[PDB]
């Protein structure tokens, strides 16, 4: 009931809630990050898992934005989890492809709820 849409690998970070200025690593090494379409819920999600620890389970809505802050790093806010996720990539192209997929998914999310 869940189809993978796009898969990449990145280092995952979350912004420190107190200072809002520091990145806390949410994974020791790089982890798999995937976009999924949830056929049961008619929604798109970003899912990253490190064994039995679910690091990212972000449902993507049209309002959410992925902001690139370097050639290899970008971030998006997830109000449901009350956090900001950052992803660090080993090549600039992986960041670009992730950002482009993110924008694609935002419109799919809005078109899917029409």
């Amino acid at each position: 009931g869940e189809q993978p849409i796009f898969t990449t690998r990145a280092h995952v970070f979350q912004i420190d809630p107190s200072t809002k200025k520091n990145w806390v690593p949410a994974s020791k090494q790089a982890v798999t990050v995937s976009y999924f379409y949830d056929v049961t819920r008619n929604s798109y999600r970003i899912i990253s898992v490190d064994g039995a620890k679910v690091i990212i389970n972000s449902t993507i809505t049209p309002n959410m934005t992925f902001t690139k802050t370097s050639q290899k790093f970008g971030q998006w806010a997830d109000s449901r989890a009350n956090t900001v996720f950052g992803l660090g990539f080993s090549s600039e192209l992986q960041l670009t492809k992730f950002a482009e997929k993110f924008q694609e998914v935002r419109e799919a999310a809005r078109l899917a709820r029409d």
Binding site: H11, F13, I15, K20, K21, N22, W23, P25, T67, T69, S70, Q71, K72, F73, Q75, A77, S79, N82, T83, V84, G86, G88, F89
Partner: peptide
Amino acid sequence: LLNFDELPEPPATFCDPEE
């Protein structure tokens, strides 16, 4: 709020060079 008045710097490993 989760809003940023200023965007945060990326982690030092993933920053763009400056110079």
